[PDB]
Write a protein that binds this DNA or RNA. Structure first.
Ligand code: MG
Ligand code: MG
Ligand code: MG
Ligand code: MG
Ligand code: MG
Ligand code: MG
Lengths: 51, 113, 101, 269, 78, 467, 204
RNA sequence: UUGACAUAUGAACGAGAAACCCUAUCCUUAACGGGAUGGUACUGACUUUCAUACAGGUGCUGCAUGGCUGUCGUCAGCUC
């Protein structure tokens, strides 16, 4: 059970905040051009099913 | 005399990836100095992440070991042990053997002879 | 728990195998004595068969802790051969040197 | 002042920047200590202030300027290609990098020579008397002091002697007379010699357990046990191959216990 | 002793409590052994896709359940 | 059979590894920790627009029993040249307003990091504060003698004791209590007489020897209780009391004997570092005095004069001023003139020592140029390419313009979508002076780096040769 | 250069307040109690005000107690035989009065009252040394003899109605767990407890 | 079906409840799971549940790429 070890970067909130900022920036770049994830329960094939 | 030290003594075994003669200033003082034969472990891995089976790169992990003998007396054993617990040998893991003598109390087994 | 997504199922299996080790050993030891009564041997065989199959050590697969690769994982380094070669050519792996005998 | 009113005072003190709510704080807490009803609360306030973390956010500009002001630039490197040699050479120049017993007694005796330290000859003398006194005492003096102490304890138990200081004076006179009359490699003791073996592994990194730690071996010569031929043959049958006939040596190794001292006990048992 | 095989034949745990009551329905357990007490019962053995019907007789005792439900279709070349 | 990393062919000779340790039972833990720590330390404080950033050229890690040493190497910020009393909001919300035989053994781990553990430094600070404060008047004459020997005698300067102790509970019973608990917790036969050999450094008065032997013989044979007739002799059995206080007299020495608290100073010698804040500490100490005396005595003193007229326990006001000093020191946050770099280094050292169960030490060396390692040049090129300011040719020309003279050559390769007009990627190479990688006795350094762009990944490879 | 000194002086003045109240308070209260409160304040500032030298001394003491109090680095008295009988140790007090003449000769101690004060303060400072050694060494050790006696006791609890083969199985399981260093003692007694619990399910 | 896993935001319960865990036990599932019964310990800048930004993809493009590799080729060439 000790095979997969802890990663020491989780002790620093600055690195985690930087990674989360990168993820949120990529998410907003997707959302500005309307290529982000659809609403859960309202997928494209599900929207054509309700059409 | 060049004969073997067979009595009360501290033996030190030092294992490292590098030669301890490169930094011999950090070695503890000793009466005898001996070396074990080198031992290697061969690793052969594929160079490419995909199919290039005949292309290999070979690595090794070479083990080095030295043996140190410190002649001591029975009273100067804990005093030597205190400073031996705090040494810093450069890039190594050291190993303390203790050879000490006591005397056997035969009073609970003298009746059975 | 550990971070790599393709190592999650194996990590869960390793934790489950650590949880159920004592019961597995007890039931296997009960099933191993032939002088025991047959009813006790059958009930311990039943409890050995009711242990979760993900808690067995044979389901555990050694994966790379960096990438999650399931193949060519050296056990001493816990990394795949590609990670091993990449770290070894940079001098990052202690004691690892190019062999040219 | 209750805790709810004190919360407002503490809150108005923290995030305003002016030294205005402190008279209210000292007034409320002095009143709370005088009434001494919230005596269980001040301890957890002290714990909350001391142990709970605060907003320790260091900005990058302060980080860089505060790093730059404290470190002088190195002038002998010119590259980082031989940096581990630089660190190892810095460790070389430290004369007390590794301390042994000889350097320690050298600096101890030189501190003695400057009056800062005392010689320990009196201490090792009193330790020698505290450890081995029955070998440094003549045998007749042992029973003489025992008989005198028996006489003093016989006369003390009567009660009419008032022997709270007379017995001490009599013992002091007897000890003065005894001092006037008296003052004018292999192991110690006796028996067959045991030969122990022990190992300590000094692994780096704060995890000190190693599989080689617990094993203890004990050796003895069978001829030193005084056994007969039949007893020696029964011992050889019981032992088997742990006995070596060429060295006449019986070796008992114990590793089945978790700790070194348990294996040392198990060898002798 | 009288036993010629020291190890018992394997049976899954759901067949060890209700016994023949579990053998009038669909069975996914191809690794179990057909016991002598299972005779005169009808089982439907999963082959990967469908539950293949099998009738337990005297000659099926000591075999695995998966020996009577084939997993690959016997195939022909044009 | 393609071109390999230049580091690998000259790793045993002409270049050393950045780490220095050995283990066999713990190889996997340390080989994971090297990569994981070097990956963590390279992501610390990236360069913003206004900041030069934390740049690591080398990290040197050395592992010892219970101790690990980290040595950082940073380039200085290139810049062309010509408050704490009022801080708020840096302390927040204040809540809290309103099986004896079958014990568990010590847990062990082999491959990774330890779990979260509460610290011990508060108890150590308490034991070193309320005990062994060395303001007791026994030590004053000896430290005066030490100062006189320092400022007057040349023999107290070429000696090992001065060099060791000055690098340019009384402590005997504390050791006895510590060894008692440490030997009885592990069920070890604790003989306190044998412990006294640690107090002895051996490398007329025979009458006292004889009386001490007699007293030891008297106390040895006795202690056979359940008899009142001999208990009357036990009442006058204070003949060992005369042996107890026999060796007493005037003392003029501070014990720096007894090699256990000399080991504390030995560990202190390599752990002080290059930074201290005592000059700010004394200033804050003498200003918090006049802050405290101006705070009490503002016509609210009727509670304090009620306290002093209560009883002789006036000194429980010290707990009130404890809470006060804690409140003002919590309002500020971070010490007065404490170095922010060393505060962050201490914050890193705390969790590194808690996770590794060691005593880690981080020491920093500031170096002149960013051209002293291939890693620093690659990192600088990647940060110049992260925000678009210039082209590859201008980057190489700026690099070649300020090459120090140690560099006998350099080579930089760029890979990816180098031109925004075209879709096909290409590789552009720039070489300066000598970059022969097939000569093994040369000092060739190499480092790759990747650049995250809008159109994918750009890659920089840097070769540099030192003389 | 006027602005930085002006700002620092203004911040220092708004920090310390007006000095008249301090001089007014120092005269009302008295000089010797002022001295005691000053001693109390400087006793606070070695704890409340953090120092780099104090933290360095704390780290050095931490390293010394790490290396010294590690149970894997135990060596016994090198001239002594192992304690087979496993005698209980005598209390700390008695150990300290056992070594009284040596400590008096080594430490000074002019009279009996100095020794009594030293023993009293060492006794008051012993409870937190206990917690320090608990943090460093670990919980306990528990010798092999008591572990084996516990393992044998647990077996003897095999329910009385159970056949002789079950009792033989439990005794042999205790015997083979008796000589296994690769098992923790917690795992050993948990194994024996679960064996007895499984046996007791069918032999009430 | 906000998911096995992460972060953020907003509500709801909870000043010691619940989730969580176990030397756990029993029943029911082909199995994961599901349902009961005990015990220990924790929770207020904190736990859980819900909601939505989402999380997730060994899906496609090596003819968008980084990194790594094969080959011409240990051939004596290729350049400034
Ligand atoms: Mg080998
Ligand atoms: Mg992936
Ligand atoms: Mg497998
Ligand atoms: Mg898929
Ligand atoms: Mg291609
Ligand atoms: Mg190809």
């Amino acid at each position: 059970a000790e095979w997969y070890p802890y990663d020491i970067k989780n002790e620093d909130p600055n690195v985690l905040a930087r990674e989360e900022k990168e993820r949120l920036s990529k998410l907003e770049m997707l959302k500005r051009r309307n290529k982000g994830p659809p609403q859960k329960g309202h997928g494209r094939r599900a929207a054509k099913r309700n059409k | 005399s060049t004969s073997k030290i067979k009595g009360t003594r501290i033996c030190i075994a030092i294992r490292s990836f590098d030669n301890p003669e490169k930094e011999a200033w950090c070695l503890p003082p000793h009466s005898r100095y001996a070396a074990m034969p080198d031992t290697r472990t061969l690793y052969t891995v594929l160079r490419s992440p995909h199919v290039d089976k005949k292309s290999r790169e070979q690595f090794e992990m070479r083990f080095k070991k030295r043996f140190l003998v410190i002649k001591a007396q029975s009273h100067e054993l804990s005093n030597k042990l205190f400073w031996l617990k705090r040494y810093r040998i450069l890039g190594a893991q050291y190993e303390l053997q203790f050879h000490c003598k006591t005397r056997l109390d035969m009073s609970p087994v003298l009746g059975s002879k | 728990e550990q971070g790599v997504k393709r190592n999650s199922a194996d990590h869960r299996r390793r934790l489950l195998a650590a949880r159920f080790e004592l019961r597995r050993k007890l039931y296997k030891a009960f099933c191993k004595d032939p002088e025991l009564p047959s009813e006790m041997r059958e009930k311990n065989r039943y409890k050995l068969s009711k242990l979760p199959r993900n808690s067995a050590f044979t389901r555990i697969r050694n994966r790379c802790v960096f990438t999650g690769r399931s193949r060519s994982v050296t056990e001493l380094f816990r990394m795949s051969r590609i990670c091993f070669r990449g770290l070894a050519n940079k001098g990052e792996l202690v004691g690892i040197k190019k062999s040219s005998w | 002042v209750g805790n709810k009113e004190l919360k407002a005072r503490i809150e108005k003190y923290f995030n305003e920047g002016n030294e205005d709510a402190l008279p209210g704080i000292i007034e409320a807490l002095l009143q709370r200590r005088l009434a001494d009803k919230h005596a269980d609360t001040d301890d957890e306030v002290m714990d909350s202030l001391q142990n709970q973390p605060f907003k320790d956010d260091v900005k990058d500009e302060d980080f860089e300027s505060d790093f730059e002001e404290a470190h002088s630039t190195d002038d002998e490197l010119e590259d980082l290609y031989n940096s581990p040699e630089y660190v190892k050479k810095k460790m070389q120049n430290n004369e007390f990098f590794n301390m042994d017993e000889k350097k320690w007694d050298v600096i101890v005796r030189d501190g003695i020579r400057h009056g800062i330290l005392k010689d320990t000859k009196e201490c090792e003398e009193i330790l020698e008397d505290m450890l081995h006194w029955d070998k440094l005492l003549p045998d007749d003096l042992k029973k003489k002091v025992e008989a005198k102490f028996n006489e003093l304890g016989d006369m003390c138990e009567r009660g009419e002697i008032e022997p709270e200081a007379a017995y001490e004076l009599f013992k002091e006179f007897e000890d003065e007379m005894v001092i006037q009359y008296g003052d004018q490699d292999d192991p110690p003791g006796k028996g067959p010699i045991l030969r122990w073996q022990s190992r300590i592994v000094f692994a780096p990194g704060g995890d000190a357990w190693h599989p080689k730690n617990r094993k203890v071996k004990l050796s003895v010569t069978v001829k030193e046990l005084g056994l007969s031929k039949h007893q020696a043959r029964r011992l050889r049958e019981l032992v088997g191959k742990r006995y070596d006939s060429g060295k006449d040596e019986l070796t008992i190794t114990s590793e089945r216990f978790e700790h070194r001292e348990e294996n040392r006990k198990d060898c002798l048992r | 002793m009288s036993r010629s095989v020291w190890k018992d034949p394997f049976v899954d745990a759901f067949l060890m409590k209700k016994k023949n009551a579990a053998l009038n329905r669909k069975i996914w357990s191809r690794r179990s052994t057909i016991l002598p007490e299972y005779v005169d019962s009808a089982v439907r053995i999963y082959n990967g896709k469908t539950h293949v019907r099998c009738k337990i007789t005297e000659g099926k005792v000591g075999h695995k359940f998966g020996e009577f439900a084939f997993t690959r279709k016997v195939k022909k070349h044009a | 059979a393609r071109k390999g990393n230049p580091i690998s062919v000259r790793l045993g000779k002409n270049r050393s590894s950045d780490s220095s340790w050995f283990s066999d039972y713990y190889y996997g833990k340390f080989v994971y920790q090297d990569v994981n720590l070097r990956s963590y330390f390279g992501s610390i404080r990236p360069p913003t627009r206004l900041t030069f950033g934390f740049r690591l050229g080398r990290c040197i890690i050395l592992h010892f029993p219970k101790r690990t040493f980290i040595h950082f190497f940073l380039p200085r910020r290139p810049r062309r040249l010509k408050r704490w009393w009022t801080t708020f909001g840096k302390a927040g919300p204040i809540g809290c307003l309103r099986n004896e035989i079958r014990g568990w053994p010590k847990k062990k781990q082999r491959y990774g990091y330890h779990d979260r553990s509460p610290s011990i430094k508060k108890n150590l600070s308490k034991l070193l504060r309320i005990s062994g404060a060395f303001k007791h008047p026994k030590y004053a004459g000896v430290v005066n003698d030490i100062a006189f020997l320092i400022e007057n005698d040349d023999s107290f300067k070429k000696t090992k004791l001065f060099k060791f102790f000055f690098p340019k509970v009384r402590p005997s019973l504390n050791f006895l209590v510590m060894q008692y608990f440490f030997n009885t917790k592990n069920q070890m036969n604790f003989d306190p007489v044998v412990v006294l050999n640690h107090f002895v450094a051996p490398g007329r008065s025979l009458q006292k020897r004889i009386r001490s032997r007699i007293a030891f013989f008297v106390e040895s044979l006795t202690s056979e209780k359940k008899c009142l007739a001999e208990a009357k002799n036990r009442l006058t059995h204070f003949i060992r009391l005369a042996n107890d206080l026999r060796f007493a007299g005037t003392t003029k020495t501070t014990i720096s004997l007894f090699p256990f608290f000399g080991a504390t100073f030995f560990f202190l010698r390599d752990g002080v570092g290059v930074y201290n804040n005592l000059d700010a500490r004394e200033q804050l100490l003498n200003q918090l005095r006049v802050k405290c005396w101006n705070l009490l005595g503002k016509d609210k003193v009727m509670e304090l004069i009620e306290k002093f007229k209560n009883l002789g326990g006036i000194e429980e006001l010290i707990k009130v001023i404890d809470m006060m000093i804690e409140i003002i020191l919590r309002k500020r946050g971070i010490p007065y003139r404490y170095n922010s770099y060393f505060y962050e280094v201490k914050k890193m050292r705390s969790f590194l020592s808690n996770r590794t169960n060691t005593k880690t030490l981080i020491e920093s060396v500031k170096i002149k140029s960013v051209y002293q390692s291939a890693s620093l040049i690659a990192q600088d090129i990647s940060f110049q390419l992260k925000n678009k300011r210039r082209s590859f040719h201008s980057i190489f020309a700026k690099i070649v313009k300020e090459i120090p003279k140690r560099v006998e050559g350099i080579r930089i390769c760029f890979s990816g979508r180098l031109k925004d007009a075209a879709e096909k990627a290409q590789t552009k190479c720039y070489k300066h002076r000598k970059t022969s990688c097939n000569v093994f006795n040369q000092k060739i350094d190499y480092a790759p780096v990747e650049v995250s762009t809008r159109y994918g990944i750009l890659g920089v490879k840097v070769w540099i040769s030192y003389s | 250069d006027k602005k930085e000194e002006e700002a620092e002086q203004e911040a220092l003045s708004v920090f310390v307040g007006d000095n008249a109240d301090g001089e007014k308070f120092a005269k009302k209260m008295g000089d010797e109690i002022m001295a005691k409160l000053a001693e109390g304040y400087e006793d606070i500032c070695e704890r409340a005000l953090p120092s780099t030298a104090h933290d360095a001394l704390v780290d050095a003491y931490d390293t010394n107690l790490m290396i010294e109090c590690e149970p894997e680095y135990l060596m016994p008295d090198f001239g002594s035989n192992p304690d087979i009988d496993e005698k209980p140790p005598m209390p700390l007090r008695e150990c300290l009065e056992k070594v009284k003449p040596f400590i008096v000769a080594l430490e000074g101690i002019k009279d009996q009252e100095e020794w009594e004060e030293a023993i009293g303060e060492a006794m008051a400072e012993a409870p937190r040394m206990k917690e320090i050694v608990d943090h460093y060494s670990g919980p306990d050790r528990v010798t092999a003899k008591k572990q084996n006696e516990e393992l044998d006791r647990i077996a003897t609890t095999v329910p009385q109605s159970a056949p002789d083969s079950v009792k033989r199985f439990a005794d042999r399981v205790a015997l083979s767990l008796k000589s296994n260093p690769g098992w923790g003692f917690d795992k050993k007694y948990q194994f024996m407890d679960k064996l007895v619990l499984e046996v007791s399910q069918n032999y009430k």
